[PDB]
Amino acid sequence: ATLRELRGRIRSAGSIKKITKAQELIATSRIAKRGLCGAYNAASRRRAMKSATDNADDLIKALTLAANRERQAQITQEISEIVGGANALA
Amino acid sequence: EREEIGTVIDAGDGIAHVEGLPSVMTQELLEFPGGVLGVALNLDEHSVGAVILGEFEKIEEGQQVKRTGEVLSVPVGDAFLGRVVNPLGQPIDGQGDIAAETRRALELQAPSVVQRQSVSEPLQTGIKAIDAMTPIGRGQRQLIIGDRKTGKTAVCVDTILNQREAWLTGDPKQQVRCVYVAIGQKGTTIASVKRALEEGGAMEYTTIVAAPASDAAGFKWLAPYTGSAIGQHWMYNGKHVLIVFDDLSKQADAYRAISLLLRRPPGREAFPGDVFYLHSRLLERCAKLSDELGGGSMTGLPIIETKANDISAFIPTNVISITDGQCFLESDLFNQGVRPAINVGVSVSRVGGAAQIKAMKEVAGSLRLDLSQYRELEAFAAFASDLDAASKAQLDRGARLVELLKQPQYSPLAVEEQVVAIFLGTQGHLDSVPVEDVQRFESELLEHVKASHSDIFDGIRETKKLSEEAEEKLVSVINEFKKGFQASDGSSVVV
Amino acid sequence: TAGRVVRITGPVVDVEFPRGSVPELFNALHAEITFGALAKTLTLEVAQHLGDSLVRCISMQPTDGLVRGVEVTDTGASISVPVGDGVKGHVFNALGDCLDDPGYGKDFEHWSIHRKPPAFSDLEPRTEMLETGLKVVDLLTPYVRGGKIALFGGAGVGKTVLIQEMINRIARNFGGTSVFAGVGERTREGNDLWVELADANVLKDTALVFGQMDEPPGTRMRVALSALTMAEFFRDEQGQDVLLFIDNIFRFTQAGSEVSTLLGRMPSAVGYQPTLADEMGELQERITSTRGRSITSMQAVYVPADDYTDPAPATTFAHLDATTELSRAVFSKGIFPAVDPLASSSTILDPAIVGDEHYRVAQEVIRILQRYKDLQDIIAILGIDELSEEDKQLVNRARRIERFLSQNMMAAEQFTGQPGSTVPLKETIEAFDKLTKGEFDHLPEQAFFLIGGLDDLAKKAESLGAK
Amino acid sequence: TAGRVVRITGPVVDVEFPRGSVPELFNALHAEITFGALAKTLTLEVAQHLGDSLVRCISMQPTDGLVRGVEVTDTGASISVPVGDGVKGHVFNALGDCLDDPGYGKDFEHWSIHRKPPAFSDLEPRTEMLETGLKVVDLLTPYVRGGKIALFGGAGVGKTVLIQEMINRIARNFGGTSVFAGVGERTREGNDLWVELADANVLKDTALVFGQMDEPPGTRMRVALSALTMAEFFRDEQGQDVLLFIDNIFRFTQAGSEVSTLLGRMPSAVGYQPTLADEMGELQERITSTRGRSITSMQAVYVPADDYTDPAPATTFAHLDATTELSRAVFSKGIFPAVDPLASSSTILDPAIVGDEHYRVAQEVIRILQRYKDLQDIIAILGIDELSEEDKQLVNRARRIERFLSQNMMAAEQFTGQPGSTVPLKETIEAFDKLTKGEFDHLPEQAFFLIGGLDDLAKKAESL
Numbered sequence A: 001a002t003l004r005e006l007r008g009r010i011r012s013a014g015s016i017k018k019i020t021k022a023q024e025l026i027a028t029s030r031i032a033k034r035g036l037c038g039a040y041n042a043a044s045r046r047r048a049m050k051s052a053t054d055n056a057d058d059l060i061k062a063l064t065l066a067a068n069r070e071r072q073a074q075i076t077q078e079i080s081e082i083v084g085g086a087n088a089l090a
Numbered sequence B: 001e002r003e004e005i006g007t008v009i010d011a012g013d014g015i016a017h018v019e020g021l022p023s024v025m026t027q028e029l030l031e032f033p034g035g036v037l038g039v040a041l042n043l044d045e046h047s048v049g050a051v052i053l054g055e056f057e058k059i060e061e062g063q064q065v066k067r068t069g070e071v072l073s074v075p076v077g078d079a080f081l082g083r084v085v086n087p088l089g090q091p092i093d094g095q096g097d098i099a100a101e102t103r104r105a106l107e108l109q110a111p112s113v114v115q116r117q118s119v120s121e122p123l124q125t126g127i128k129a130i131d132a133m134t135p136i137g138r139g140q141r142q143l144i145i146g147d148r149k150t151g152k153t154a155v156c157v158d159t160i161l162n163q164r165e166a167w168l169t170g171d172p173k174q175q176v177r178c179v180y181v182a183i184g185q186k187g188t189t190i191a192s193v194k195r196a197l198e199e200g201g202a203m204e205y206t207t208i209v210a211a212p213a214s215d216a217a218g219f220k221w222l223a224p225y226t227g228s229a230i231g232q233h234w235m236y237n238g239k240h241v242l243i244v245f246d247d248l249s250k251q252a253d254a255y256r257a258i259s260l261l262l263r264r265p266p267g268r269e270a271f272p273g274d275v276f277y278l279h280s281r282l283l284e285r286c287a288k289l290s291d292e293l294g295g296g297s298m299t300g301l302p303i304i305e306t307k308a309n310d311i312s313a314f315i316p317t318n319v320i321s322i323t324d325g326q327c328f329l330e331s332d333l334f335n336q337g338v339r340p341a342i343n344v345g346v347s348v349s350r351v352g353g354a355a356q357i358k359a360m361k362e363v364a365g366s367l368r369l370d371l372s373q374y375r376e377l378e379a380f381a382a383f384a385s386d387l388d389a390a391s392k393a394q395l396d397r398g399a400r401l402v403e404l405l406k407q408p409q410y411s412p413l414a415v416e417e418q419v420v421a422i423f424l425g426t427q428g429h430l431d432s433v434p435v436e437d438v439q440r441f442e443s444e445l446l447e448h449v450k451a452s453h454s455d456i457f458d459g460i461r462e463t464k465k466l467s468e469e470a471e472e473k474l475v476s477v478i479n480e481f482k483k484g485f486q487a488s489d490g491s492s493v494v495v
Numbered sequence C: 001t002a003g004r005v006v007r008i009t010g011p012v013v014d015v016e017f018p019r020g021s022v023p024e025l026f027n028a029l030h031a032e033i034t035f036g037a038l039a040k041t042l043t044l045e046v047a048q049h050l051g052d053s054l055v056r057c058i059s060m061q062p063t064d065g066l067v068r069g070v071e072v073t074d075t076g077a078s079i080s081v082p083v084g085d086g087v088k089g090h091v092f093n094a095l096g097d098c099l100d101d102p103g104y105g106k107d108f109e110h111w112s113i114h115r116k117p118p119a120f121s122d123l124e125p126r127t128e129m130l131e132t133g134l135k136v137v138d139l140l141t142p143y144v145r146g147g148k149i150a151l152f153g154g155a156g157v158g159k160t161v162l163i164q165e166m167i168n169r170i171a172r173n174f175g176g177t178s179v180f181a182g183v184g185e186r187t188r189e190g191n192d193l194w195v196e197l198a199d200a201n202v203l204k205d206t207a208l209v210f211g212q213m214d215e216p217p218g219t220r221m222r223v224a225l226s227a228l229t230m231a232e233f234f235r236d237e238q239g240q241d242v243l244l245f246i247d248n249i250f251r252f253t254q255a256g257s258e259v260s261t262l263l264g265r266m267p268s269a270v271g272y273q274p275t276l277a278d279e280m281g282e283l284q285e286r287i288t289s290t291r292g293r294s295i296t297s298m299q300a301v302y303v304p305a306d307d308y309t310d311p312a313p314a315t316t317f318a319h320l321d322a323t324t325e326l327s328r329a330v331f332s333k334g335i336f337p338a339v340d341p342l343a344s345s346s347t348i349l350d351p352a353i354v355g356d357e358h359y360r361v362a363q364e365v366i367r368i369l370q371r372y373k374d375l376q377d378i379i380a381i382l383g384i385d386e387l388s389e390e391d392k393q394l395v396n397r398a399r400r401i402e403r404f405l406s407q408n409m410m411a412a413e414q415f416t417g418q419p420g421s422t423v424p425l426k427e428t429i430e431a432f433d434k435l436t437k438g439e440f441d442h443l444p445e446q447a448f449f450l451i452g453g454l455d456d457l458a459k460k461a462e463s464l465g466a467k
Numbered sequence D: 001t002a003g004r005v006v007r008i009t010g011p012v013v014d015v016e017f018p019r020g021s022v023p024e025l026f027n028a029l030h031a032e033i034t035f036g037a038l039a040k041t042l043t044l045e046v047a048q049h050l051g052d053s054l055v056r057c058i059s060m061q062p063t064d065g066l067v068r069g070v071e072v073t074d075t076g077a078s079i080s081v082p083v084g085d086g087v088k089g090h091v092f093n094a095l096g097d098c099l100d101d102p103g104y105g106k107d108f109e110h111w112s113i114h115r116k117p118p119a120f121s122d123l124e125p126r127t128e129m130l131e132t133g134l135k136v137v138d139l140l141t142p143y144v145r146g147g148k149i150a151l152f153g154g155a156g157v158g159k160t161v162l163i164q165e166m167i168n169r170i171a172r173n174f175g176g177t178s179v180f181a182g183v184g185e186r187t188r189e190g191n192d193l194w195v196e197l198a199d200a201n202v203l204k205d206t207a208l209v210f211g212q213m214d215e216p217p218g219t220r221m222r223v224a225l226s227a228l229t230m231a232e233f234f235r236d237e238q239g240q241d242v243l244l245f246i247d248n249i250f251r252f253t254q255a256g257s258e259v260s261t262l263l264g265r266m267p268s269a270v271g272y273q274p275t276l277a278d279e280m281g282e283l284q285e286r287i288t289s290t291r292g293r294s295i296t297s298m299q300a301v302y303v304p305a306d307d308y309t310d311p312a313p314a315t316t317f318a319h320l321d322a323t324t325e326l327s328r329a330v331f332s333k334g335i336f337p338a339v340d341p342l343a344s345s346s347t348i349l350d351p352a353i354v355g356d357e358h359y360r361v362a363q364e365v366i367r368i369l370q371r372y373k374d375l376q377d378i379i380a381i382l383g384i385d386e387l388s389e390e391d392k393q394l395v396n397r398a399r400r401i402e403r404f405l406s407q408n409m410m411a412a413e414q415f416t417g418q419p420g421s422t423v424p425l426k427e428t429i430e431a432f433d434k435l436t437k438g439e440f441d442h443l444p445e446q447a448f449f450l451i452g453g454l455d456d457l458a459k460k461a462e463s464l
């Protein structure tokens, strides 16, 4: 279930990235003319959503690397089981 | 008649080991008592390992096995049209004998690299998404790949049904003979497919090779080759053939089963080291022959079922590498109402525009980029006012084009109708039409044009081009019909 | 001319026979265990001819106490079970012995449990809806009379409860014969079903065949064939409509995988036997209606580890006309039946068979739920307020729809304490048409949870202060 | 002294020889299938010595119709391919048989396909740049002489035209020749390539070696070595520069995996053959520069699951000197060759190799194009008006630079009547330095489409 969970997380992160990039562009437009504004309460929305888009990109990259490690490892483990059975039947 | 004989030395789950038969050939057909048939796959010093093609429970140690002196072969001829046969060419539809013109060995080599010519003739599927985005030419191998229940069989059946007008022309250069190979399918599923083909009058020109799920693994392994041999007989006689393999995943599973039972070394996913060879040998027989050999062709539509949409699995990877293009179907698109559920962003035809007629090539030129831009902009759907005019127009046009590519099942369209529909989409004639109405609008327009302006369709079909006069007449007809059309929200679609 | 045990390894026994007396494949042989505590008569099924007059067989009972060299007798035939109207109202094991009245059915006609499936020319596709009264089933996974229905799911998502629900709604008023095959499932569940059928007075029309999960692999392999042989007799000889329930068919496959390597077969992917699809094909293709002879079959299919890509359920999917796929995700939300509306399917859900209105409403429900699934991660991170107005409306509608697909079932009262309900198909279609238009958007979503029709909805809403 | 078939298991054939006549490893043996429909001569390749005078071999053709006990003849050598100038303009399979003219080249000199790389002392210790004359390649992703260039890009991006362009340039600029190795070649595409090269009139400059997809894994494994052997003859005996095209190298790796599985070897990680790295090294180390002559290779590389850490691409990229990615986006703009200047890379774009000025100009081009890519989304969604004036200046300059990376290619003369250009490296460096400095922003954009150096730029600017 590890690979399935990782793929679900990759899909979630991709959707979040798309939404945050759209919001960053909308904030760019609104600058020329809610609480997603970074440390504003504690322009700012544009920077916060650019940061969030970059963070989601990094998350997608890391999750994809983990997913590929898991995919390779599953192939290797499956082959190990198959060949172990074959050897024991040799 | 002084026959060479061997003896069954062991038998288990569809495999028999037979001593003797010193002169047996690799892949030779063998006869076991009770009219049981086997295939010699493993030849060694001690015995011959044989795949039993049916009634394995009849086999017993000590039974006499005879060699036939012949590798696997099947009868072939025109009489197989409209019939359902098993991978040995035997009818299973209960409709009597099939008169065979001749016999073909299943493993005859594919046409060579100098016995072909470039794929240049459209194989119209009648499905707008395919005929515009990933066109298929005669001689091409176009993989239909997707998860279960994504509409793969529906697309193949629609293609076969679309060949009916071509059949009725009576001209062998336009006619397409269809072979449907069912591998591992439930018998009533095959019956449903045949019923669908009969309703659309496709069994006139269609043969079904059936290897249902209850058949021996040998039959499932052999069925694609049998369908290929039947089709090849026509291909080498100047005919054009469309063969559907539904589906090659089941055939690979059957071959893996046989190989493991034969103790052949397993690799990734436990497949033998020649599964790629299995499918590539099958699919390279689909070809477009040169004029020296009669110019016939066979178009392959292998179907692959992915699990959780993992196209990097072993067998999908192999078949994707083998084929000339891929139609990826997706269940998420299917649930979104995008039917047929083809992912135009990842689907490809390497033959491309060479497989389209000029009119389709023209009207469909901008489709790919329009759809890509729409997919990029979809995030900004709710901010369309904030979008600049160009991006807003791109968003609206993409929505309308996505509606345009939708198609009901069992209803393929003629190439002229497809051209007119895509012309509506890509010439901005759907811009004034509400998205939710596009489909209906299109259908009605196509009805209208067929009722009173057939000359447009006639010009497109005869010339394969949309002339300037035809285009202007079509535009005026569109605007008049727009005056006539009632949007579901009541707003006029005029201007 | 008798054999003798040569090797014993768990449930697989090698038997040597005199040359010229090797039993045919699938023949039943008898061997004695004489140890007092475990004394019994083993039935062995011939699996392979190993050569040199040796056969590899699968024991039907545990081999504990079996001794090398003891006599093995060939019955000359396959395992055969009693058939006829007499099997109705009685409980049998995979070997045909009657459990509730031992010795009963000894004198009946007996049929071998190994049989070829119907000929292809005798097969007729079935397109006729079998209305259940369950909203989600009737709307999104309509069942087919005389067709093949499966309930897929991981462990403990409600396959058995839904099987009992379908016995309640379909078998109770059935005008034909019912066959229930317990394949490798809990003995307690079998006793519960037996008692419940006796209470409902459905037992008199039902033949029960049990091979429980505690039996050796051979029994779990053959019990389905035994039940199916009884059903086939009712289909082809008596010529009446038959209901066939199997819980759980996956056990068949699992049992086959448990003896595969002991039978000397190199394992396939994911540890399954190489013959997975072929054995499943034999069995499943026997489970079918033929022209004029109806078997409505309903199979519970266990999905190992909830992994729907697992080869067993993946291979099973091709054999069904309708599939209700149960989801752990839906279960954990408290939605019962835990049906995944997006993944489930039915071959008769198209306008031609079910009509334009039903098809349209079902497609709209699926589209809304798919969009909600797409939006769930965004709602989890950024919150709902960052959606567009239309997406917020769709999310509210989707939450109400997903809750309204849940239903208080008759078989679930033992768990909720709430009595069940039945919803007519027309009412279901109208209710979901209203829901997809937002006609109930003003009611609290908790008003839609585990109810029947629109009257139940109104009552619960008033109980919640809405209307 | 001839052997006999003892076991047949698909493409694996066990053969028994008399005690003292056992063939050496990798020897080519010949057997006959006499059944009329499938009649053929099988080539087996000795893979293992099983002991007791048995050898295990991989059949190069399907074994259907083979009979136990048939005679097996030892040729006394490994698979050997014809070599010489005669192989140019002709199509061969992995065994040296001519496909376009059966029997052709049987009298040529024949070289064994199993050869060692140049001796360690015979190698050139310093990298060199293969000046192609194409602006984009020369400036941003210079190719290494004797190195390996990965090529990427789906159908329809101008990949075949780029291959034809490189064939042209190696033939006309370096006086060299080309060898195309279709590893796991689709027969339709092999035929298409043959006809297209004949139409382009570059077939005479190139030898085609096809190991087709529908062949057993052995030929798909050995076809790359066969093409490499022809290229090695051209480099070492005819003293020519050779360009060796391999499509697809991943299919060579996968055919190796299939063979390894067929021979009963236990798979390594992710199912590949245990000797994956050794096989790839044996292939790739033969592609080098030695004694003043070089084989340069452009190799199509498939990446499973887009996973660059997958063992096959990971092993292949240990040997790759440059990467050229062809982008549908660039192609759609009419910029040919459609090389994606940002995704493409070269390991010799360093000051120490190409010089300081080249490095500086290339980095400036990359920076401008990257900033343009960043501004692209704003341009598309909010419009170019929203951008600051400096952003507009950068957009104009970057658009001119990216159009100037286009060129009129030799192979493009057959579609557009105009001939191609060869821009010297110094000219490209100075032209792009001026372009980055902003000395042509006034000139119209179309002036930069499909031209050579600065003379062409001035000519087209005045013609507009």
Ligand SMILES: Nc1ncnc2c1ncn2[C@@H]1O[C@H](COP(=O)(O)OP(=O)(O)OP(=O)(O)O)[C@@H](O)[C@H]1O
Pocket: B146, B147, B148, B149, B150, B151, B152, B153, B154, B155, B339, B340, B407, B408, B409, C346, C347, C349, C350
């Ligand atoms: N264009 C379409 N429009 C609407 N429904 C469609 C369309 N194409 C297919 N369907 C429906 O989708 C469902 C799946 O179709 P189909 O059986 O062809 O898919 P599949 O991928 O081949 O499935 P399987 O896994 O059963 O082989 C069926 O109900 C079919 O009627």
Ligand SMILES: Nc1ncnc2c1ncn2[C@@H]1O[C@H](COP(=O)(O)OP(=O)(O)O)[C@@H](O)[C@H]1O
Pocket: C153, C154, C155, C156, C157, C158, C159, C160, C161, C162, C336, C337, C409, C412, C415, C416
């Ligand atoms: N419709 C339902 N309503 C309430 N609880 C249910 C319902 N269905 C199942 N459950 C709970 O989940 C458990 C699993 O049901 P069961 O059908 O036995 O699982 P499986 O899917 O493994 O057969 C039940 O024992 C019950 O406690």
Ligand SMILES: Nc1ncnc2c1ncn2[C@@H]1O[C@H](COP(=O)(O)OP(=O)(O)O)[C@@H](O)[C@H]1O
Pocket: D154, D155, D156, D157, D158, D159, D160, D161, D162, D336, D337, D409, D412, D415, D416
């Ligand atoms: N530099 C160019 N000038 C003119 N036309 C080109 C150029 N590059 C590519 N094309 C056209 O684009 C098409 C695709 O190019 P090609 O290299 O054949 O793609 P692929 O190799 O992927 O099939 C060709 O038909 C060709 O006519």
Ligand SMILES: [Mg+2]
Pocket: B152, B153, B154, B246
């Ligand atoms: Mg299908």
Ligand SMILES: [Mg+2]
Pocket: C156, C159, C160, C161, C185
């Ligand atoms: Mg249960």
